Amino acid sequence: TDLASIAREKGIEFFLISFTDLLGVQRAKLVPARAIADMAVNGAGFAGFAAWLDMSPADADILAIPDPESLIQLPWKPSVGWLAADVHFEGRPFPKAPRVALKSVLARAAGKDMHLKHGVECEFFLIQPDGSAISDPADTQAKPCYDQDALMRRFDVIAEICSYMVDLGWGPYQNDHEDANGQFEMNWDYADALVTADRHAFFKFMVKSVAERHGLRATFMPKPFAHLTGNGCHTHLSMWTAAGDNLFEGDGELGLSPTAYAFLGGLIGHAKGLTAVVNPTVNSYKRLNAPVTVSGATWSPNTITYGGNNRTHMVRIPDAGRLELRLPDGAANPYLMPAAILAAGLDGIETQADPGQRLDIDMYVEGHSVEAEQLPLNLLDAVRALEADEVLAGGLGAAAAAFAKFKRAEWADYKSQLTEWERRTTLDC
Amino acid sequence: TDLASIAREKGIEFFLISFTDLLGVQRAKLVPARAIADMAVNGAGFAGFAAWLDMSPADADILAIPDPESLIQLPWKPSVGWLAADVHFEGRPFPKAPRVALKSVLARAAGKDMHLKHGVECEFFLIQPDGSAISDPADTQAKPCYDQDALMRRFDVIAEICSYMVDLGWGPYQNDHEDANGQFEMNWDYADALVTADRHAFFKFMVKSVAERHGLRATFMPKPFAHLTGNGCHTHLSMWTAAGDNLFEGDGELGLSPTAYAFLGGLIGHAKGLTAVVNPTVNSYKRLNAPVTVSGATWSPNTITYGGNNRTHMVRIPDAGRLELRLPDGAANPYLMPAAILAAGLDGIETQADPGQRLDIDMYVEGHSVEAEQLPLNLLDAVRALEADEVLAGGLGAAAAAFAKFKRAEWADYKSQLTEWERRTTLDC
Amino acid sequence: TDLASIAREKGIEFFLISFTDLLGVQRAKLVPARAIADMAVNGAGFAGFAAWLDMSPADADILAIPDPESLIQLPWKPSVGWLAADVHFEGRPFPKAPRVALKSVLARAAGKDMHLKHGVECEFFLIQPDGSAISDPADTQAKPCYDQDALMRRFDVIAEICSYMVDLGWGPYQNDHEDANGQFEMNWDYADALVTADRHAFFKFMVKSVAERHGLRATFMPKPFAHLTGNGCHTHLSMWTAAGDNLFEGDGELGLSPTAYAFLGGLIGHAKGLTAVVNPTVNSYKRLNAPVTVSGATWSPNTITYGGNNRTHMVRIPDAGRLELRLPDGAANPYLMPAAILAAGLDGIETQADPGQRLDIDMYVEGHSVEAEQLPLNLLDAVRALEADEVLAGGLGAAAAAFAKFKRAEWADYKSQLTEWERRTTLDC
Numbered sequence A, B, C: 001t002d003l004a005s006i007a008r009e010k011g012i013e014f015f016l017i018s019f020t021d022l023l024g025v026q027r028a029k030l031v032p033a034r035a036i037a038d039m040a041v042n043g044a045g046f047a048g049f050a051a052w053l054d055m056s057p058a059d060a061d062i063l064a065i066p067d068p069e070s071l072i073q074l075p076w077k078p079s080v081g082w083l084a085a086d087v088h089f090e091g092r093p094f095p096k097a098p099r100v101a102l103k104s105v106l107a108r109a110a111g112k113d114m115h116l117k118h119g120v121e122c123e124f125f126l127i128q129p130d131g132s133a134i135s136d137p138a139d140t141q142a143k144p145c146y147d148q149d150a151l152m153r154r155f156d157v158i159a160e161i162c163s164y165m166v167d168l169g170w171g172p173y174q175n176d177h178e179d180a181n182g183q184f185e186m187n188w189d190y191a192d193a194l195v196t197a198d199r200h201a202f203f204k205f206m207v208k209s210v211a212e213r214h215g216l217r218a219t220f221m222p223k224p225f226a227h228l229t230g231n232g233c234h235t236h237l238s239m240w241t242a243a244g245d246n247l248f249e250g251d252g253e254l255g256l257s258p259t260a261y262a263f264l265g266g267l268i269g270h271a272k273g274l275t276a277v278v279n280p281t282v283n284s285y286k287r288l289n290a291p292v293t294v295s296g297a298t299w300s301p302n303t304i305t306y307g308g309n310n311r312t313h314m315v316r317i318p319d320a321g322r323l324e325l326r327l328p329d330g331a332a333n334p335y336l337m338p339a340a341i342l343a344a345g346l347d348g349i350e351t352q353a354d355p356g357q358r359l360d361i362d363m364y365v366e367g368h369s370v371e372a373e374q375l376p377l378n379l380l381d382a383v384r385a386l387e388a389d390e391v392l393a394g395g396l397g398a399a400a401a402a403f404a405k406f407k408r409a410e411w412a413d414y415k416s417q418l419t420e421w422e423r424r425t426t427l428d429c
């Protein structure tokens, strides 16, 4: 069946033909069902410079061609169908568009019979619409993680969204209040990277939209409050043959194969550049290497290291047959994040990279007793690392340079902003 | 029947897989019904350091394995089923988890054919959401105990909660307004210790949840107002054989057996360390040994003594065949409280402990006369006594040392806080 | 010099025995005239850890021995005499004290018959006491530099201070409104470095004091407003023989000698580490490499370069026989600044350092035109450079290590502060 028939069968009156730009912003046209057939073949036209794609106002329209397999009837508004799209320019997929960049990396891995599957942990906060405070003034205790009371106080919002994921078939399996006051996490089944990436992009839209209907606001900001735990977007990772075998399952340490350790070697080896992509904002660097929070731990990475089932490192091994990359934050691009992770891991496999020694220690407490490379400390340093990393920059194609350009502009803007701390501590010099 | 079938049968859309931590905080994940079968067998995963379990962020996930027999469909929201769970760590029940600690003491006792049954008197206040005052501004008289007017003014909340307990089969039998303005008590049938402990944990959650739905707020704080009676959590206690005989029933004084008096002897003998557990907060020590209240009596213990049917001692004998321990307050952990009480009682029975002479006097008025040992006067001293008590510390296992550690941290935090009384009386020194 | 007799003669009732700590803070004891004799010999005691000296509370008292030659009767309150002092510890001048550290460098240069003389341009803003805005709401035009109206609107403050400098014999010669709205500059004759350093320390204190008496507030903050020119503290520099000849006076380009150019070579060669000392705050790095201001130019350095009479470089040659280092800002330590500049310049002279090619262009406009090294972009990088620079670190001795430690701590504190720009631009990620 084609989209026009489906629209008629399911009662879809409009479609959002949607794409994700380099900064993660969802761009779309809302097209009435009468126009979907033509759009589905030829794509919907956009002026690319108006989005974060690093183009020019003089360029021809890009055409975003929807992937009919990605269709989602908005569970909160079923007369509307959401579609993920590949941006095309000059008759070909446009290499600066995140989804296109990911599919390229995926195609290279697939040609080696290695298929990335991943799940995302999209932690978010529920806050007042004005952004001044969390949504629940009674959520105050020092260790609020897994709080039953505060979770159930937001039951209506959380249950509504979980039930939508049940109906969409994502296989959600748990929800909780997370470690910061105001913060939540809703988990669902991993899938082929592309599937998860589209789900990741839609999920954020869904949470934000539903929150708003409830008179709340959701944020995925990496570090919205200085003294509270931040928003991670941990990525659990495994690589599979087309025949359905998990290449990461093995007889080695912690139930991992040498292929899993080499992939891990790639993450470790390329970590500095990876950070630019998966911690893509100035604020990202206040979540990494952060002072101890009120709850007693940041739970985010400080160092380029890994442990076993241990949440104090860049990588955790949570169970046999997979790796948890704890590095990414809530701002990480749903498509660029897996693309950069795969480029790194693939190079790790191809070069049989050594991940180094597993550290079975609490890095927050004992990191001083061990020599370990620190992660890049600010956005500018991460971006330089990205630019200097041939495997990453090469693997992401033109997206990498465009991304770096934008982040450098953001940095230049940020660095000129006077802060209150400066006024307080310098006025009397 | 398994949880998945029950969910379909009864229309349960989500389960709360819940455990109680060392500070009594309810920790939970909300899992959709599709995922309960896996969770019931393997348990829900948590990072234990994020709760009050005294672990490390570097530790592997604990697994909370729900007890299917504990299942409660939330009477105010039947699409959600609540389950109490045992925390497991590294393949075994985690001894720092209160519910596990209790089960361990129960198993020892049960190996001697002695089964603890207890009922709890969970006094609470209904207060304004902001915590500034009690919920009912017309509840003002000096002696408000059993006030018909003020009870019926909160009929809707109280009656709703009692009806839920009727329907859950807890066998509730009375409700009243208690001795402080704003304060209430709802009583239900005693049961095997583990059942009562689970019910106790659920009850506080239910009262808080329903209070909130009525625009009100419930608190179990031991001494929320300095001039009014505090919140106790008295435990009525008896020991039974597997065959169904109450070992406390006897031919001695007041219808008690030698076994009852030896148990009492353990309570008396271990009372100092027991206080740390059942009066577990700084504020607990403002309910114990308190100045007379507006109603004419504190009704809380001052001394390590017992009476007959007499509410002025640490222990009351309310009727043949049971003891009322009046020591515990509203902050007492639903699992550690019975665990510590049992450990002391068992040691009393095993050593044939002598509880001493029953005191048939009003200890508030005639205490000055008799030579009696006073209870610990503050949290720090009570905790010292706990650590010094081999039977208690040993019987609670690693929970004892974890608990002490947290309480010491709370004390240190508390002792540095400047109070208004100090400013008023010292500013002009 | 007999301070007791002077007190009687000039009517001095109290002395401020004053030292400058590593962060530039003026530390002092106010001693009645009856006690000056004893203090002048033995010093006034302080607990050094309570100031920014990097000591320990377990250390013996430091003793601040006043320099009677530095005596200044507060022109606005002549019953008080101010004295600059050298901190001593365990019987020897304390090497971490800025004045002591400066005198050490001066002594080395003096042994080679080279005597540093310098003048300082202590730009400041006059602001509202609450620090929210500038003091004069009518000072608003885009190019306010040398504004006659706005200067005369603050005649009373400016004139009062200038007349004080006339009377103290400092040889003031001009005052103006500077390039930022609210900003002013008052200039006086150069002198022997130690003399200028003491005058500099006193000047800041006198301006702040007099501003306050007029219901205003003075700040020397490097960049108090993002869009306006910042506060520099340019130093004009020359080296003299004990016989009274200016060694910088010469036949080379622009009336400079080979010695001047070799001194300049030290400045250029050591610029990266020098930045840490003369741009000592986080905020300093918003004045350097700043975006264009409303007035059309920042007038501060971006690059490690020099020009002729040209205000767009790190060093300007303003006239025959001297150099202007435009690098330092208003937070520069009055003693550490000259000390570090001298260490760098002496090394230049000793190694006949080559300053490179003079650039006769506007670096703000034609920086892209030529390869030039950029100055450190932030405090942490500048401090790192200080530590790696043997001449500077060695030249300032222990003061450099201690300075670097405090500034690292400042950075740690600063980098965890959430800013409004982050909230605005990241909440919707």
Ligand SMILES: Nc1ncnc2c1ncn2[C@@H]1O[C@H](COP(=O)(O)OP(=O)(O)O)[C@@H](O)[C@H]1O
Residues within 6 Å of the ligand: A117, A118, A119, A120, A121, A187, A188, A189, A190, A234, A236, A237, A238, A246, A318, A321, A322, A324, B045
């Ligand atoms: N073999 C696998 N490869 C990739 N992801 C997996 C694999 N197995 C499970 N996952 C996914 O990993 C994610 C785990 O999330 P979560 O339960 O929140 O982990 P955590 O223990 O870090 O809190 C889920 O999305 C899950 O589906």
Ligand SMILES: Nc1ncnc2c1ncn2[C@@H]1O[C@H](COP(=O)(O)OP(=O)(O)O)[C@@H](O)[C@H]1O
Residues within 6 Å of the ligand: B117, B118, B119, B120, B121, B187, B188, B189, B190, B191, B234, B236, B237, B238, B246, B318, B321, B322, B324
């Ligand atoms: N043999 C027993 N052992 C333990 N608890 C019991 C026994 N008999 C009754 N109880 C319980 O004791 C509790 C009494 O509560 P309550 O009526 O408020 O007592 P009181 O106000 O007199 O102190 C109830 O939970 C009741 O079920």
Ligand SMILES: Nc1ncnc2c1ncn2[C@@H]1O[C@H](COP(=O)(O)OP(=O)(O)O)[C@@H](O)[C@H]1O
Residues within 6 Å of the ligand: C117, C118, C119, C120, C121, C187, C188, C189, C190, C234, C236, C237, C238, C246, C318, C321, C322, C324
């Ligand atoms: N030979 C010299 N060595 C050091 N400083 C000098 C020398 N000659 C003049 N100065 C001082 O340099 C400073 C010049 O300040 P200023 O007039 O504000 O210069 P400009 O604004 O042109 O940069 C004055 O303090 C002046 O006394």
Ligand SMILES: C[S@](=O)(CC[C@H](N)C(=O)O)=NP(=O)(O)O
Residues within 6 Å of the ligand: A121, A123, A179, A185, A229, A230, A231, A232, A233, A234, A287, A298, A299, A300, A311, A326, B047, B050
């Ligand atoms: C409890 S936590 O470790 C918290 C992570 C933190 N929010 C962060 O990554 O910044 N998350 P999880 O156990 O779900 O992996």
Ligand SMILES: C[S@](=O)(CC[C@H](N)C(=O)O)=NP(=O)(O)O
Residues within 6 Å of the ligand: B121, B123, B179, B185, B229, B230, B231, B232, B233, B234, B287, B298, B299, B300, B311, B326
């Ligand atoms: C009337 S009272 O004695 C009050 C007890 C008091 N609230 C306390 O234990 O602090 N309780 P009960 O008669 O229910 O045992």
Ligand SMILES: C[S@](=O)(CC[C@H](N)C(=O)O)=NP(=O)(O)O
Residues within 6 Å of the ligand: C121, C123, C179, C185, C229, C230, C231, C232, C233, C234, C287, C298, C299, C300, C311, C326
């Ligand atoms: C007009 S200016 O060049 C401005 C300097 C600026 N305030 C700065 O150095 O940041 N000062 P001057 O001419 O007095 O040397």
Ligand SMILES: [Mg+2]
Residues within 6 Å of the ligand: A121, A185, A187
């Ligand atoms: Mg998770």
Ligand SMILES: [Mg+2]
Residues within 6 Å of the ligand: A121, A123, A178, A185
């Ligand atoms: Mg999480």
Ligand SMILES: [Mg+2]
Residues within 6 Å of the ligand: A121, A234, A324
């Ligand atoms: Mg995780």
Ligand SMILES: [Mg+2]
Residues within 6 Å of the ligand: B121, B185, B187
């Ligand atoms: Mg009762």
Ligand SMILES: [Mg+2]
Residues within 6 Å of the ligand: B121, B123, B178, B185
């Ligand atoms: Mg009662």
Ligand SMILES: [Mg+2]
Residues within 6 Å of the ligand: B121, B234, B324
């Ligand atoms: Mg009772």
Ligand SMILES: [Mg+2]
Residues within 6 Å of the ligand: C121, C185, C187
């Ligand atoms: Mg000047």
Ligand SMILES: [Mg+2]
Residues within 6 Å of the ligand: C121, C123, C178, C185
């Ligand atoms: Mg100037």
Ligand SMILES: [Mg+2]
Residues within 6 Å of the ligand: C121, C234, C324
């Ligand atoms: Mg100048």
